[PDB]
């Protein structure tokens, strides 16, 4: 059975709500496992306390850079980077969870939650989960973004784990 993980989101330290995600371990097991373990922190590092550094309304919310907090950092549980596992799943609409990258085979810890259909990313970014509960909370987060992606308040993962 596919794992479910949660993020409790805060805005300038104030609780906003919870978003949960189904991870598609049945189709992208290596990529799902990376996100799962980073969400429980069981390897000794992970997403708890990290921020969403880039939020563009009508496109995506990007996070997962727990080492440099700005899009230049992060690392996977397999090392600094890992390969594109497959591209079976596509960017079909809001709620899709997909890996950020900087070229072929450069997955780390950064990810994005789509808030629109982003079909031009198909075959370039590995899709590995979807929002299960709390899409309304993603929509609320999105309002703190801007056209250039800077956030008007600090959006953090106050807690996270596996359900």
**DSSP string covering 99-148, please?**
E--SSTT-B-S-EEEESS--GGGTTTS-EEEEEEE-HHHHHHHHTT--TT
**Cβ pair 43, 157 in contact under 8 A:** no
Which residues have a catalytic role annotated? Answer: 54, 59, 62, 101, 112, 121, 125
- Is residue 35 within a helix (H) or strand (E), and if so which, with residue range? helix 29-40
DSSP bridge partners of 4: 22
Q: Which CATH superfamily is domain 1-163 in?
A: Cyclophilin-like (2.40.100.10)
Torsion of CA 50, 40, 80, 146, to 10 degrees: -30
* 14: CB partners within 8 A, 6+ apart: none
Distance, CA of 35 to CA of 58 (rounded, Å): 24
Please give the structure tokens belonging to residue 133.
């509960």
Please give the structure tokens belonging to residue 40.
């429980």
Nearest to 14 by CA among 122, 156, 135: 156
Domain range annotation of the chain: 1-163
């Amino acid at each position: 059975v596919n794992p479910t993980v949660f993020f409790d989101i805060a805005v300038d330290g104030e609780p906003l709500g919870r978003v949960s995600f189904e991870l598609f371990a049945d189709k992208v097991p290596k990529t799902a496992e990376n996100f799962r373990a980073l969400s429980t922190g069981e390897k000794g590092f992970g997403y708890k306390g990290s921020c969403f550094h880039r939020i563009i309304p009508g496109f995506m919310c990007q996070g997962g850079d727990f080492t440099r907090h700005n899009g230049t950092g992060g690392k996977s549980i397999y090392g600094e980077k890992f390969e594109d596992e497959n591209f079976i799943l596509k960017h079909t609409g809001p709620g899709i969870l997909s890996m950020a990258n900087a070229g072929p085979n450069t997955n780390g810890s950064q990810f994005f939650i789509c808030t629109a259909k982003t079909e031009w990313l198909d075959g370039k970014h590995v899709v590995f989960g979807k929002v299960k509960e709390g899409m309304n909370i993603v929509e609320a987060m999105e309002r703190f973004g801007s056209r250039n992606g800077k956030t008007s308040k600090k959006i953090t993962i106050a807690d996270c784990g596996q359900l």
